[PDB]
Symmetry: C2
Subunit: 97 residues, 2 copies
């Protein structure tokens, strides 16, 4: 789908059997989701920005607006689920103007 940017680019994602809304974010290198539990081992990691402590999980399956992708997902105290470039490239997402 082609998505204009008059409103936040929110999409439905399915991860770990749960349904959530998340922002397609070209300015985020990584994907960060609010608290939830995931499979496998996890390692502490710190992330930067403008305004945190996150756990990092690898090879996590996420379905984003119907397109499946697998990758690293960070789980921390974020005020919004963010789908970053590491997964956007997996679904073939591009910016166009």
């Amino acid at each position: 789908p082609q998505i204009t940017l008059w409103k936040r680019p929110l999409v439905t994602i399915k991860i770990g059997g749960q349904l959530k809304e998340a922002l397609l974010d070209t300015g985020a290198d990584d994907t960060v989701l609010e608290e939830m539990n995931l499979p496998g081992r996890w390692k502490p990691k710190i992330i930067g920005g403008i305004g945190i402590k996150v756990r990092q999980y690898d090879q996590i399956l996420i379905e984003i607006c119907g397109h499946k992708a697998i990758g690293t997902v960070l789980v921390g105290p974020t005020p919004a689920n963010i789908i970053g470039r590491n997964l956007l490239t997996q679904i073939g997402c591009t910016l166009n103007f």
Copy 2:
């Protein structure tokens, strides 16, 4: 131009006679640039996120990768120049996948 997301989507912008690099950021409602001075009055404003105090300027001219846009620009202590949706919609930018 169509831009893939394997690397950060940085573009050249010209604002207030200066040349800078900035991130096309679909996850940002607003545009925030590092310190610089601009024309007109400005009002204090606070912005949210994951990891601030910014001055807000209105009707500011910015040329982004060759496309001119005019709008609100926030100037604060950001570690990167961010071009948000308020200006992305002006240049006709869309996400596609």
